[PDB]
């Protein structure tokens, strides 16, 4: 599990696997978010740049922070 | 009845029961905050993302922190 | 009066009585900071939501800690 | 030795052009007359709003730039 | 005397320290007086003045000596 080398398709699959994100995943792909970009995102970006609501933004960022661990 | 598995509606009722929060509850719901998101909130998010003032934000976060114990 | 049960109006008066804070008290009232919120404040909160500089923020927080003991 | 603050529009062009997927985005940096000084002031939102760059690339480009500032 | 220092007493004290001649203007920009200076902590310097931990540590150490 090295998210640092994930592709845009890998990130889409990852986001799509998260509860309630089947649709939000297309926004990650539309913004060409790959593994490198994924690890740099913060709630701010998710809300400002991708119109994601605060609840999902935080739960997604919590799932991202868990990846940053092995 | 464990906040970590609360729904958006559960969080709405919880915030709604709080002094001065009957409208602010609608903002939690519009933001789809469930138990898992509620427990990750910090004062800064309430003020920035939901435009809540610092006094209510402090008191809400305090009510949230008492849940975690 | 114990600070924990102070109203927004009480907090205004307290901050307003402090050297250099006559205007800063208006920001406290605008933020609907009552006693409960006042005692939960930290310097970062003062610097963030109220643009207060660290020098006064440290002094306002010390004056606040003076209340809590 | 390097000093990004005194880079010209051409220097910045070459730098962005060396970045993965940016051979084309570099022409927009030049069209916007971004020199070293401007380069160091850029943020993701500027890149998205002013240059039509998507968030994933904007994030990665700003990260490479932040590496310069060090 | 340090407890009764002015915002100027501080600028003057900080300016005296290695590498601290310029960041001394920050203390006046944040209006740090004696009582503020003596209640200041490392995390505060990192947050409010963008200072890195090494310098924040050394600056606070010089301040704690005053006491």
From Swiss-Prot, chain A:
Compartments where located: Nucleus
Transmembrane segments: none
Residue span(s) of domain SAM: 6-70
Note: The hPRC-H complex purification reported by PubMed:12167701 probably presents a mixture of different PRC1-like complexes.
Functional description taken from the UniProt entry: Component of a Polycomb group (PcG) multiprotein PRC1-like complex, a complex class required to maintain the transcriptionally repressive state of many genes, including Hox genes, throughout development. PcG PRC1 complex acts via chromatin remodeling and modification of histones; it mediates monoubiquitination of histone H2A 'Lys-119', rendering chromatin heritably changed in its expressibility.
Assembly mode: Component of a PRC1-like complex.
Name listed for the protein in its UniProt record: Polyhomeotic-like protein 3
Organism: Homo sapiens
Lineage: Eukaryota, Metazoa, Chordata, Craniata, Vertebrata
Shown segment, full-protein numbering: 914 to 983 of 983
UniProtKB/Swiss-Prot annotation, chain D:
Annotated transmembrane regions: none
Localization annotation: Nucleus
SAM domain residues: 7-70
Oligomer and partners: Component of a PRC1-like complex.
Note: The hPRC-H complex purification reported by PubMed:12167701 probably presents a mixture of different PRC1-like complexes.
Reported function: Component of a Polycomb group (PcG) multiprotein PRC1-like complex, a complex class required to maintain the transcriptionally repressive state of many genes, including Hox genes, throughout development. PcG PRC1 complex acts via chromatin remodeling and modification of histones; it mediates monoubiquitination of histone H2A 'Lys-119', rendering chromatin heritably changed in its expressibility.
Protein name, as recorded: Polyhomeotic-like protein 3
């Amino acid at each position: 599990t090295e998210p640092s080398i994930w592709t845009v398709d890998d990130v889409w699959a990852f986001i799509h696997s998260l509860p309630g994100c089947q649709d939000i995943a297309d926004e990650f792909r539309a913004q060409e978010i790959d593994g490198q970009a994924l690890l740099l995102l913060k709630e701010d970006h998710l809300m400002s740049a991708m119109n994601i609501k605060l609840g999902p933004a935080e739960k997604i960022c919590a799932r991202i922070n868990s990846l940053k661990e092995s």
